[PDB]
Amino acid sequence: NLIEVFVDGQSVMVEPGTTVLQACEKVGMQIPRFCYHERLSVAGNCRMCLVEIEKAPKVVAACAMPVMKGWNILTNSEKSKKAREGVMEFLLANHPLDCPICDQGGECDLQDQSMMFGSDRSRFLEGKRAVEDKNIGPLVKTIMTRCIQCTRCIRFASEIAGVDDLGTTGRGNDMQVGTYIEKMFMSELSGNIIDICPVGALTSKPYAFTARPWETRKTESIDVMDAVGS
Amino acid sequence: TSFGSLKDEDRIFTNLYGRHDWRLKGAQSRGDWYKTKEILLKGPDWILGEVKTSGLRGRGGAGFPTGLKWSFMNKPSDGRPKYLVVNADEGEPGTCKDREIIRHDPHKLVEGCLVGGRAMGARAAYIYIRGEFYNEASNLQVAIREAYEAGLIGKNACGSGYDFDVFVVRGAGAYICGEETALIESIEGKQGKPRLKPPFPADVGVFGCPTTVANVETVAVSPTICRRGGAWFASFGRERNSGTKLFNISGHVNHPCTVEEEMSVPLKELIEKHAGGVIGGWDNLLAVIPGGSSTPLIPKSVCETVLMDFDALVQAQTGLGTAAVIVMDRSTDIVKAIARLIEFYKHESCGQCTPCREGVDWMNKVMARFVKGDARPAEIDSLWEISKQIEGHTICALGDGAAWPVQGLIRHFRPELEERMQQFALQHQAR
Amino acid sequence: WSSTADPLSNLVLTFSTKEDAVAFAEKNGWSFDVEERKVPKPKSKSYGANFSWNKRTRVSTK
Amino acid sequence: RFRGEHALRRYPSGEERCIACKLCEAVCPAQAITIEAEPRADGSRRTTRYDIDMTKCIY
Amino acid sequence: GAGGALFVHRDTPENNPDTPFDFTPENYKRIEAIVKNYPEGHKAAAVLPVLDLAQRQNGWLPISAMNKVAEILQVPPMRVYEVATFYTMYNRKPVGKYHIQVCTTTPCMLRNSDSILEAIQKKLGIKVGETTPDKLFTLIEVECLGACVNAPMVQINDNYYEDLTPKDIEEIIDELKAGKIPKPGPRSGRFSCEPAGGLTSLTEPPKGPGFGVQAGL
Amino acid sequence: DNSTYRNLQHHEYSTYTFLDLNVELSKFRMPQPSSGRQSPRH
Numbered sequence A: 001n002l003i004e005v006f007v008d009g010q011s012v013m014v015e016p017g018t019t020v021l022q023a024c025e026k027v028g029m030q031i032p033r034f035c036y037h038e039r040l041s042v043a044g045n046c047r048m049c050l051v052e053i054e055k056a057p058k059v060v061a062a063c064a065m066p067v068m069k070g071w072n073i074l075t076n077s078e079k080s081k082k083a084r085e086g087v088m089e090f091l092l093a094n095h096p097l098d099c100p101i102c103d104q105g106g107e108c109d110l111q112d113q114s115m116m117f118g119s120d121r122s123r124f125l126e127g128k129r130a131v132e133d134k135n136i137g138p139l140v141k142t143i144m145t146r147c148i149q150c151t152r153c154i155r156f157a158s159e160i161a162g163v164d165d166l167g168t169t170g171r172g173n174d175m176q177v178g179t180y181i182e183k184m185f186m187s188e189l190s191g192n193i194i195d196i197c198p199v200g201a202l203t204s205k206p207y208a209f210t211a212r213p214w215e216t217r218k219t220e221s222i223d224v225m226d227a228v229g230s
Numbered sequence B: 001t002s003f004g005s006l007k008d009e010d011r012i013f014t015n016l017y018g019r020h021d022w023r024l025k026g027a028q029s030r031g032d033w034y035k036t037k038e039i040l041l042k043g044p045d046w047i048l049g050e051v052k053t054s055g056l057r058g059r060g061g062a063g064f065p066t067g068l069k070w071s072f073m074n075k076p077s078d079g080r081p082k083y084l085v086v087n088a089d090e091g092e093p094g095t096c097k098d099r100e101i102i103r104h105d106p107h108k109l110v111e112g113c114l115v116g117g118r119a120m121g122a123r124a125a126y127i128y129i130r131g132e133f134y135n136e137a138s139n140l141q142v143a144i145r146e147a148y149e150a151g152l153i154g155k156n157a158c159g160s161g162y163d164f165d166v167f168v169v170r171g172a173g174a175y176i177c178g179e180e181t182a183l184i185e186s187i188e189g190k191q192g193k194p195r196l197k198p199p200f201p202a203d204v205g206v207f208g209c210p211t212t213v214a215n216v217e218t219v220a221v222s223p224t225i226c227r228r229g230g231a232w233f234a235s236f237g238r239e240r241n242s243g244t245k246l247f248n249i250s251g252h253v254n255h256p257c258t259v260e261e262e263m264s265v266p267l268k269e270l271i272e273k274h275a276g277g278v279i280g281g282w283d284n285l286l287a288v289i290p291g292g293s294s295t296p297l298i299p300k301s302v303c304e305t306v307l308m309d310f311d312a313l314v315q316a317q318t319g320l321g322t323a324a325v326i327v328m329d330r331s332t333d334i335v336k337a338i339a340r341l342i343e344f345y346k347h348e349s350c351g352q353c354t355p356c357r358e359g360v361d362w363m364n365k366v367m368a369r370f371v372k373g374d375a376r377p378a379e380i381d382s383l384w385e386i387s388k389q390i391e392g393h394t395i396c397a398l399g400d401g402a403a404w405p406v407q408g409l410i411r412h413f414r415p416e417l418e419e420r421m422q423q424f425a426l427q428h429q430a431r
Numbered sequence C: 001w002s003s004t005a006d007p008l009s010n011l012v013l014t015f016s017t018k019e020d021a022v023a024f025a026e027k028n029g030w031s032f033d034v035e036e037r038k039v040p041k042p043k044s045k046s047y048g049a050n051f052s053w054n055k056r057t058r059v060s061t062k
Numbered sequence D: 001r002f003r004g005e006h007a008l009r010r011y012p013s014g015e016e017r018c019i020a021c022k023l024c025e026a027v028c029p030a031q032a033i034t035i036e037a038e039p040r041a042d043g044s045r046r047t048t049r050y051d052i053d054m055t056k057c058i059y
Numbered sequence E: 001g002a003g004g005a006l007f008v009h010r011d012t013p014e015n016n017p018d019t020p021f022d023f024t025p026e027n028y029k030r031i032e033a034i035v036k037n038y039p040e041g042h043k044a045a046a047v048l049p050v051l052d053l054a055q056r057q058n059g060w061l062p063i064s065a066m067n068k069v070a071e072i073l074q075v076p077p078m079r080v081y082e083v084a085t086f087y088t089m090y091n092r093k094p095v096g097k098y099h100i101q102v103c104t105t106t107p108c109m110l111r112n113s114d115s116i117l118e119a120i121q122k123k124l125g126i127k128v129g130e131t132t133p134d135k136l137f138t139l140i141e142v143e144c145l146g147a148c149v150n151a152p153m154v155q156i157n158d159n160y161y162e163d164l165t166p167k168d169i170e171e172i173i174d175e176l177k178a179g180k181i182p183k184p185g186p187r188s189g190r191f192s193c194e195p196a197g198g199l200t201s202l203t204e205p206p207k208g209p210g211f212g213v214q215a216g217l
Numbered sequence F: 001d002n003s004t005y006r007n008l009q010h011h012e013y014s015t016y017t018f019l020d021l022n023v024e025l026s027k028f029r030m031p032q033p034s035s036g037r038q039s040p041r042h
């Protein structure tokens, strides 16, 4: 049967094996996340989803930790806020200043989560990291200095598209996401990496520089290019 | 009561220093491979009880009850293989005990693997040895071949009806692959980035099977504990810290070495007895790192009266770690030494998760500026806060181990940092 | 520039409930098409499925 | 600090400073700025249309 | 500091997928022995040993060798590239005949490891990441090698030379370039990790079998 | 007599010593467990 957990003291009935992030979503709280995608596997590396359990001295990765009976999840606690601020601080410390020239622009998860969960000032007094851009076809434009090594594109590529030509090379702060060779990521499902990349590292090349998200009007229609009716 | 003065009749790791034969005949000249069949017939529950009574704690860093861990592994079979994984990726900066155990007591290591596998119900034992230890791995393979020929391992091991295999896996250079979950990942032919708990290795380990990771010294002292009692092993040591331990004394010392002593020998006595003391005398001591790079440093004041023990060093805002005693005398640059340690951590970071990755690179840069004073006094507390953000927010314990030396340096030698910054400010002002 | 002649081109209204929106549209006399809210189905996520002993869910990279 | 007639500046090299980021268009209270951009022949992020209506601008 | 080696591959005449490479039949037998050390359905676990064997055979790891290993193990070439780039013991670029690796961590830095490095640099006339013009020696800095009590030390082709002094390391380099093979181990008179002053432990003969065995067994 | 270093057999090993030792004790092994499939990709 369902077990009883608590989110900020509010009782929730969840199935065994449900994660902390899913319990908070069920109660109505969307925990900030970068590497977590519901359609993909659980990676738990960006560490942005760390939350505090009421009696646990250590924060837990909400996207990977299954809930136990009688767990009180403190979503808006001081420890959770400090953890989110620290993770955002590291991300933006190594992130480059490209927002005006970056197509992700006003629809960026890094920007929005920085404005909602991170600090507003920088303590980084050193130089930043620069990463050589790759070329993976005429559809996806890669500016890899903006990558946050969230491994969404790798996981999507392998699991969904059945193509394992993406991965991380090297280790440490020098880890780079790409192909390691001049190979184009050509597949019939290669725009979804543009969609799911939380930052502007992977962007649409035909759409490059043309518009900004706040200007666009969204019309909900269907697809006719095939018989799927997407 | 007093601790130390361990007797050669009670030292578990005989043949240390390689002064006796390391082959099967040499090991059998000592107590090795004695009544192993009787122990296996005693079975898993008896071995686990003996280990619990002995109270052996984890010898490869974080000291956990090995009896409790193996009891965790002692769940009933559910249609999957069972593995004991012996960690020999001795990448900790200061440790040579595992190398000595492998190179000089390979049959002790193999018998310990067999006993642990019998206690865990394990079909196989993968000894993951670091790739730099090529000669040690070859000696281990020679000993394994001798054991197989003698029938001590293989089907019907030691004539007990229990089938057990021992394999040796040579890793590449990765201090992160030293870690248990990263080691499991490296065995499976992946990059070697640590997993997230849960699932715990006792539930999902290498190949997805129940596998338990144990240190070389832990598995090597297991069969001696089984052959002997464990009341004796508990007698050697304090109440909650029992047994003998291998200490690697190195650095600014007269006679750097690796020795075996009681688990609560005072640090000053150990340095003055088994290593010839500090080079300029004990009055010339500056700092000591008692458990490898991960553990923080303690100054001479703490080292004067402290016991080389888990709880004793925890009460000293430090840890026992892997019992690697690095001694730094008064004529050294402590800031530069800690900067070199942080650079090591930056080089050895697997880079999977953001806090350790970015923060360790950031702290490397900050310390590189600190060692020349090219900073401001307001940045010391900023560095402390960065270390606190790194610590506890990472997948594996390398993030915590990369911030503890920084915290120790800030805690015990802040005046030195401020003095160096003031010196740099004065020098820049003059020009 | 992009000219227009439709006064209600930029007119978007917010309603808390489908019933409220339908009532407003009916009382104002416009025709209306109602589309039901699409909520994602609950999904079972497990970190340990990435290391399955005998299932295809095992991942080849991290 | 006087606000008068508008102008588009350049770097000393002669290259245009504007990068088609549309921040001015977004923040313009009177919606007096219209911007359309595309990749240039050398791949730069440069505008093709940058119109300001001085009868609509509030300066 | 920066490693100085890139983690992307650009095709060159000396390093391209068309570079001829294959295992010798003895190495194929070794691969067959290695592969069945892992459970059925987990052939991917042999990537590291097979790559190490390929590097031992060829002297370094070209992209052709990586692709051949991927074909042999039926694993993705990108996964093979991930492993090869992650692990630092794999030579993705040609190196000299003798790969001197000076350990420069704090336990070795406390002793004059800088003296060892300077002596090696002046003996060969190369920098800390270069190769001698005759393709004989390559010199690099490495992290802890597990011989801290025997600091300072270097590793030259899976052999440890410990307790080094500038004269000792210069003699080792001269002996290597002459053609002989020096004996690995401490050069200061010690045989192993024992204290130089003398054996402070294990000075009495070891006890025989069943010295303090329990009454139960 | 504990004055002679008896761990001198390791000044003979060659490039393929470890792998040859692994080959030699291949016959001493036992049948490996099977996951039921050729590869996780199958």
Ligand SMILES: Cc1cc2nc3c(=O)[nH]c(=O)nc-3n(C[C@H](O)[C@H](O)[C@H](O)COP(=O)(O)O)c2cc1C
Binding pocket: B057, B058, B059, B060, B061, B062, B063, B064, B066, B087, B088, B089, B090, B091, B092, B098, B175, B176, B177, B178, B179, B180, B181, B213, B214, B215, B216, B218, B396, B397, B398
């Ligand atoms: C040789 C060796 C190296 C280790 N390296 C690391 C490391 O880099 N990071 C880490 O968090 N733990 C490291 N550990 C500790 C492991 O996480 C784990 O505690 C150990 O392998 C098994 O614990 P035990 O002492 O109970 O046997 C290491 C352990 C050993 C034996």
Ligand code: SF4
Binding pocket: A095, A096, A097, A098, A099, A102, A103, A104, A105, A106, A108, A109, A110, A111, A146, A198, A199, A200, A201
């Ligand atoms: S990815 Fe986001 S934070 Fe980075 S430059 Fe683009 S808009 Fe700015």
Ligand code: SF4
Binding pocket: A146, A147, A148, A149, A150, A151, A152, A153, A154, A177, A196, A197, A198, A199, A201, A202
């Ligand atoms: S390129 Fe984008 S999707 Fe891929 S790891 Fe980097 S941030 Fe994530």
Ligand code: SF4
Binding pocket: B176, B193, B194, B348, B349, B350, B351, B352, B353, B354, B356, B357, B394, B395, B396, B397, B398, B399
């Ligand atoms: S803490 Fe560092 S070494 Fe450990 S998983 Fe995270 S990135 Fe890797």
Ligand code: SF4
Binding pocket: A100, D017, D018, D019, D020, D021, D022, D023, D024, D025, D035
């Ligand atoms: S779009 Fe506007 S705000 Fe942005 S660079 Fe051009 S003139 Fe400046």
Ligand code: FES
Binding pocket: A032, A033, A034, A035, A036, A043, A044, A045, A046, A047, A048, A049, A050, A061, A062, A063, A064
């Ligand atoms: S969302 Fe959980 S660690 Fe990334």
Ligand code: FES
Binding pocket: B092, B093, B094, B095, E103, E104, E105, E106, E107, E108, E143, E144, E145, E146, E147, E148, E151, E153
């Ligand atoms: S620090 Fe050099 S061998 Fe360990």
Ligand SMILES: [Mg+2]
Binding pocket: A104, A193, A194, A195, A196, A197, A198, A199, A200, A201, A202, A203
């Ligand atoms: Mg994107």
